[PDB]
Design a protein around this ligand. Structure first.
Ligand code: V3J
Length: 291
């Protein structure tokens, strides 16, 4: 799967909010382009002169994420974050020249991402009370990954002593994206666990935080809530469900070729961190079938 790379696999079945620190610093921002940020401005101007209803928005930038030694007490993860924007994304990661910016970053800074916006996404492996994961079909008319399968999520917009508010907004935003797109009540959702971070190599290495969220409703009830919004209540064109039993072998199915890279990230991390039992009971051959 060359279109997805794992940057972080979380320990202990995934990390709760209270075990994560963030450092939000201009030291973690994109570097100005070698010939100046005028190239980003020119692309934006061309875009607005064709689609003048478009608007810019701020985004978090992932610089890096450092895990503590396993088995330790105290904070278990440090997220190094800067700030970027939708405009900077359109002029760098989404640019036809994105691979040239990666080579220049290697040359100038020893960092393939130095000249990339790299806005941080969020996504969820969302499980039902009857043990299914939730999938969404993307419109065939959108610019990114048309007609492919996705999981719930988005790209959160800003607003340890400003850090804890930032971690709070990241955990909040994955629940908000589930309530807005799937139309579920907030009180049917668990507190999220962070499974890990996955990079989209088809979009020049931009990264998504991937979470595990449990719903107290069954697959049939989740479908009812999704549909009862009507076609205007969601960006996706349909919802469907796969037994957690069958998610284990999903990369061997015809569905895999239809998953967008960030949804592949969410399913690989679910299989590694929530699947793959470590103990004698769940590891027994009748509960963990060979092959
Ligand atoms: O939701 C998104 C979107 C896509 C990529 C990124 S990367 N940073 N934030 C993003 C936001 N879009 C694009 C514009 O039209 C509506 C759908």
């Amino acid at each position: 799967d060359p279109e997805v790379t794992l940057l972080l696999q979380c320990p202990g079945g995934g990390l709760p909010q209270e075990q994560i620190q963030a450092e939000l610093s201009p030291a973690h921002d994109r570097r100005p382009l070698p010939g100046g940020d005028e190239a980003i401005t020119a692309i934006w101007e061309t875009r607005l002169k064709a689609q003048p209803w478009l608007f810019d928005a701020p985004k978090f930038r992932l610089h890096s994420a450092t895990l503590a030694p396993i088995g330790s007490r105290g904070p278990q993860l440090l997220l190094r974050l800067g700030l970027t924007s939708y405009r900077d994304f359109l002029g760098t990661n989404w640019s036809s020249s994105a691979a040239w910016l990666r080579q220049q970053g290697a040359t100038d800074w020893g960092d393939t991402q130095a000249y990339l916006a790299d806005p941080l996404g969020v996504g969820a492996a969302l499980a039902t009370a009857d043990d299914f994961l939730v999938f969404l079909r993307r419109s065939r008319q959108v610019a990114e990954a048309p007609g492919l399968v996705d999981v719930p999520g988005g790209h959160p917009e800003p607003q340890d002593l400003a850090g804890q508010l930032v971690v709070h907004e990241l955990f909040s935003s994955v629940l908000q994206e589930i309530c807005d797109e799937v139309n579920l009540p907030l009180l049917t959702l668990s507190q999220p666990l962070l499974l890990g971070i996955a990079r989209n190599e088809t979009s020049a290495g931009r990264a998504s935080a991937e979470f595990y969220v449990q719903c107290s409703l069954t697959s049939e009830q989740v479908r009812k809530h999704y549909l009862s919004g009507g076609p205007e209540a969601h960006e996706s064109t349909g919802i469907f469900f796969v037994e957690t039993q069958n998610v284990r072998r999903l990369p061997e199915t015809e569905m895999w070729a239809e998953l967008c890279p960030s949804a592949k990230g969410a399913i690989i991390l679910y299989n590694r961190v929530q699947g793959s039992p470590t103990g004698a009971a769940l590891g027994s051959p009748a509960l963990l079938p060979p092959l």
